[PDB]
Amino acid sequence: DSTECSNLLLQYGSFCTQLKRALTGIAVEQDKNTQEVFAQVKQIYKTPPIKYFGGFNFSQILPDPSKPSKRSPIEDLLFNKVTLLICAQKFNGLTVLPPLLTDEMIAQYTSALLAGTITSGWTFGAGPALQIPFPMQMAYRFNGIGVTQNVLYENQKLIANQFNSAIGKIQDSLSSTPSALGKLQDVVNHNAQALNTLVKQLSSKFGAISSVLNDILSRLDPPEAEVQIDRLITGRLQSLQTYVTQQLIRAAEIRASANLAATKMSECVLGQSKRVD
Amino acid sequence: SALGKLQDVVNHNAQALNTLVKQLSSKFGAISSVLNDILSRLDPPEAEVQIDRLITGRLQSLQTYVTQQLIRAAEIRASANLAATKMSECVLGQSKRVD
Amino acid sequence: SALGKLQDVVNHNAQALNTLVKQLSSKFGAISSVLNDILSRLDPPEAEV
Amino acid sequence: TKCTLKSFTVEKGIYQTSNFRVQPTESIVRFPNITNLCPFDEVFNATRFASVYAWNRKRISNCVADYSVLYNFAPFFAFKCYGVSPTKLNDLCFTNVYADSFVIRGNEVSQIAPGQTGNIADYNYKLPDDFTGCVIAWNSNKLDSKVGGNYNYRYRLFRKSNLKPFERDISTEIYQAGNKPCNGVAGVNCYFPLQSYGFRPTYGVGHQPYRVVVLSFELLHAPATVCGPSTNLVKNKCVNFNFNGLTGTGVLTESNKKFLPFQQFGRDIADTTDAVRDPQTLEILDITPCSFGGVSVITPGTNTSNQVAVLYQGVNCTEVPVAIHADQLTPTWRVYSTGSNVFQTRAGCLIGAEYVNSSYECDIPIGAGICASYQTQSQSIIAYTMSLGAENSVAYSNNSIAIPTNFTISVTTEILPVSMTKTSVDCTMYICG
Amino acid sequence: TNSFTRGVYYPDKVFRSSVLHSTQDLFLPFFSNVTWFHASGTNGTKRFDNPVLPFNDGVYFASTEKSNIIRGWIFGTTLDSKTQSLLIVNNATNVVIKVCEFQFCNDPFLDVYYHKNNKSWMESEFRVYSSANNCTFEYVSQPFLMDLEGKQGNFKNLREFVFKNIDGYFKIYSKHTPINLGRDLPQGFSALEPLVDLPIGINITRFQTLLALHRSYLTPGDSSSGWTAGAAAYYVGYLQPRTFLLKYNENGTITDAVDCALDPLSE
Amino acid sequence: SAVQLQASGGGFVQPGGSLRLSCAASGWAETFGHMGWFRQAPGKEREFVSAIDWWDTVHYYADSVKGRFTISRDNSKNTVYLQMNSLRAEDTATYYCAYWDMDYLQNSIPVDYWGQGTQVTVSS
Ligand SMILES: *[C@@H]1O[C@H](CO)[C@@H](O[C@@H]2O[C@H](CO)[C@@H](O)[C@H](O)[C@H]2NC(C)=O)[C@H](O)[C@H]1NC(C)=O
Ligand SMILES: *[C@@H]1O[C@H](CO)[C@@H](O[C@@H]2O[C@H](CO)[C@@H](O)[C@H](O)[C@H]2NC(C)=O)[C@H](O)[C@H]1NC(C)=O
Ligand SMILES: *[C@@H]1O[C@H](CO)[C@@H](O[C@@H]2O[C@H](CO)[C@@H](O)[C@H](O)[C@H]2NC(C)=O)[C@H](O)[C@H]1NC(C)=O
Ligand SMILES: *[C@@H]1O[C@H](CO)[C@@H](O)[C@H](O)[C@H]1NC(C)=O
Ligand SMILES: *[C@@H]1O[C@H](CO)[C@@H](O)[C@H](O)[C@H]1NC(C)=O
Ligand SMILES: *[C@@H]1O[C@H](CO)[C@@H](O)[C@H](O)[C@H]1NC(C)=O
Ligand SMILES: *[C@@H]1O[C@H](CO)[C@@H](O)[C@H](O)[C@H]1NC(C)=O
Ligand SMILES: *[C@@H]1O[C@H](CO)[C@@H](O)[C@H](O)[C@H]1NC(C)=O
Ligand SMILES: *[C@@H]1O[C@H](CO)[C@@H](O)[C@H](O)[C@H]1NC(C)=O
Ligand SMILES: *[C@@H]1O[C@H](CO)[C@@H](O)[C@H](O)[C@H]1NC(C)=O
Questions:
Q1: Of 1.10.10.10, 2.60.120.960, 2.40.30.170, 3.40.50.1110, which CATH number belongs to E1-267?
Q2: Taking CB atoms and an 8 Å cutoff, what residues of chain D touch C46?
Q3: Glycosylated residues (chain A)?
Q4: For residue A64, how many C-alpha atoms fall within 13 Å in the half-sphere facing its CB?
Q5: Where are chain E's structural domains?
Q6: Does B27 contact A14 at a Cβ distance shorter than 8 Å?
């Protein structure tokens, strides 16, 4: 909020509007990334009221009706295990745009994908959802890897028990290990600390008299204070550009990660993948 | 909007080049954005500082453009590698990979 | 030239490192590229710029 | 919107245009306390000063007028100011100021400056290179110099070591000048460090006595001691403030944070002075910046319609952009204070778009699962919550299978970029004309 | 002795809450060597006690004096009329913090030997009352000898003064601990809020202490130093230029702080 | 800065004559500058004449003024004079007593403050 500083800023031309353009591109890229990863189904499939899938137990991953937020116990564990001052960034023009897809709608998307996989196998990923009893779907999924159907049918109860034990074990595996959610926590920490370093860069005087430019204009007269103001501005916008460039590189990395995530979502979830590991 | 991606690529390169062209018209803290004006209008024992400020601004804009191009080229390389994979499986053969 | 990619990787890294250290001779619009010469030839309340 | 896009037509979608800021309404300058402040000044015009090495001290504080007096204090004097502009001394509340007064000859006046050398500059008086402040030096021939020779004033020349900025040496011990020991007796290889001044009105101006006064302010926090001009409070409105010097704009308010008695100002993990205590009424304030926020325009595209609905990102518009005064905000268009309807989303809030319940697929994204579109409620802009898709319940059963009986050979398409333009640059051509 | 956490104060008048602020200034490193410089004598001769100190860039100072056993401090360079001083004294109702020369450092006068018999007034004390040329005045205020009545112990007034004198400000960061001591310098953290920051230009090089109460009150002693630990009258902590990192409580006080120049782990 | 200068003198000199000018100094200045006259020939551009420093240590002269120009500052009232020796007949100009607010005169073109002119004709 310094008219003289803003007017002196204009001497650098379009050097900052491209920063805004790049950041807007990053934001819409993130929106498109989450859309690509999760918006793979045109419908919202609903699990049948009864949940007896041939001895299998899915209550750990199916959304819980009791909770006010329609999230699975695994999803609740993930939400609690991921932890984000925060309000000070919004006091220097470092606004944060909320995501377009709210976590409730993302959870609904995941529940729809899960119900489609349970009640339709991989058929719904390549056309209409063709319902199929779970034991036979699992039997074919066995046939895909190279074990005959009778292997599963004669061991249906054992397979269901093993699957239930593994799904119960996964919650303890997530809870016990603190670095289980290393990647998401790392992403949040990286962006937050980059923002904090950006705002913290205001302290540096960059060779000027003082960091606060209002103080500079109050002390020195306009015909002299501009050189101090210019020396401040060079450092300030260079730091802003450094932040923008680092954010761009990290956004490209997250784009690659989200492309991989969407690819393996489509392959491993909407179907059975023969690609080893 | 069917051919969105190619149009976006062409526009994002053309407008980046146009922005680079427009950058050299900025003052960058000198008396005038025109070099010959400030060299033929001021004494050489002092014009070196103004020329240096103009040069720093211009070269900084150039480096910003080059880094932006490098990032965009990395993105295009990722897209082209994906396209080559799509060719070699979907075209040269039949792919069982769902979706 | 069959092992092109690895050779290019190592050469790119080495040349980037050499360019960075070679930047020490750049005056960047200063009297000298060595700090001691600027410190000695000029008085401290003037050599800062 | 079409101005920022540099095009006469726009397409369906939300475009960021500019930023919205609540302009300050008033100005609050509480520049002192329940009382005033001053430098007592006066000393300036006086005769009996002290020797060069005898600068004075003045912890001046509150009493008379800090300034507007000493332009006339003498016909001519030195007004060399390091840092603060000479025209802006009266408005700046210097907290820590040091007033040194002493007598030197005219020749050594130039030696009173940072990075100077000489009899006084090297040994007697040292000025810091980072000095901020002003120095007052005037010819005091007609008040210092004595016709018979004013030898009361003195200077030190044969001093072994240099002094530091604002360092002193009251000792008059005999200086040991050479290899020969003196044992405290002046003689061979020994000079008296102190030397008398030849001060007489009939003398060269270079050797003429000059009373030299040095002002050394400190321009940072802690309560001040000197500022010519101031009251009022303001407790809930975005108003410019000048708290005893601290100049800026923010929303003053009560602070539940408790200050220790010595705690003057406050802060957070930031640069901003999140909290300041009033120069009077020792009140704990909670200075915060006004409610700003980016403003974006949602349009269905000029071609379809010229009606738009704006979004004030990160703003609770129960009171900020709805109750906007006449051009109190950079967006202006005060006719859009209420418009059609005001709706509060989680991405700021929406102006001029009416919220509806019938959820559709996203047309113009907004954020937090809100989208806008242009259709019937007789066409306007709505703010429907996103619909994720048709809710289809698969009739799963333990014994039922669904098997296709037909097929469609769909032929989809996909577009993938492969290469960009192979540009090249030229430094000598581009950077340099 | 070993300063576990003592010697840390508030370096600035700004306020911060839950901020991991890091600053560069003079401090006592944690785990440093402090001299119990034990002191009184009086009886006959002078027992050459209450020794003197060189004052290298300020001193830390704590003492568990009963009530007024410890009385005050004398600073300066020559302890005579030649160089300036700082007769910072503590009376029952006030502190007379004077400065600017004084014939000489009249040691606590040779008074009666019996301490707790009948005397509680202030009269015929150390009585330097010598004086010479003068300048600055004094700053009589609420004394930094607030003696809250010891409620069954639990009040060991560890007066942790810090006499840093840079720029000409005699900042006095004291804290009257309302806690007992199982051992001298109890573990835990105790930041030092400034109590008086006296402005005057000088150049100190010696520092003494007063126990003049007209009656030497139960003062034991030894006769060595180096880093004498154990139990004694007071301390001498020489602050050094460090880079302390300080944590501020949600209420805005320094709950705890850590050096950047103590340990590799500290780094 | 703001410096008020008090220049006086002049009259009617003759070819081979002389002047004894004056220029008193008052007001605050950012630096202890040097006094002098900064004169243009009639119809000509302003030109440097002769310089004296406030410390009475530096003196300057010019070819067009050498041998007939001298600058000196009074020690009592601090009014700098312009002592003369056989001024020529072509100095029918207006002498401006300018001010340079710099401790050293690297170049005489930038003048911080201007004074009053002294129009003296040289004829009999
Ligand atoms: C599927 O697994 C869940 C998780 O263990 C089962 O829920 C538990 O059921 C037992 C009794 O069978 C209760 O004691 C636990 O409190 C339940 N825990 C939770 C988190 O719900 C669930 O019963 C299993 N499904 C079926 C059909 O038995
Ligand atoms: C001494 O100091 C102050 C300012 O430094 C003097 O103020 C001006 O002094 C000149 C002459 O010394 C007067 O002509 C002005 O009229 C004064 N200005 C005003 C408005 O006060 C002050 O007069 C001097 N005398 C005192 C009181 O010590
Ligand atoms: C399978 O679907 C195809 C269309 O995809 C059907 O072919 C259509 O049959 C109708 C019958 O009334 C004709 O009117 C259309 O002209 C046919 N279209 C084409 C492209 O041939 C076909 O009959 C369907 N077969 C079964 C068994 O359902
Ligand atoms: C203070 O005295 C010491 C010697 O006791 C001397 O070295 C130092 O320069 C003096 N400093 C000042 C400020 O007088
Ligand atoms: C603009 O939108 C209208 C919808 O009313 C559509 O009919 C028209 O074709 C669009 N024009 C273009 C080509 O942008
Ligand atoms: C904005 O203020 C309104 C009341 O005026 C309140 O209901 C709302 O929660 C506030 N929102 C924010 C972002 O603080
Ligand atoms: C819309 O939904 C129903 C009416 O259809 C009503 O309960 C609700 O308040 C309406 N308001 C909204 C959410 O648009
Ligand atoms: C299988 O599913 C039916 C509903 O389709 C359910 O009623 C029944 O309990 C299940 N039968 C068993 C036990 O396999
Ligand atoms: C300081 O050194 C002494 C030895 O003279 C030792 O007793 C003391 O513990 C040391 N303190 C520390 C840890 O610095
Ligand atoms: C802060 O102070 C309040 C009383 O003002 C007290 O109740 C609270 O426990 C304190 N909190 C901390 C952690 O200092």
A1: 2.60.120.960
A2: 115
A3: 57
A4: 12
A5: 1-267
A6: no
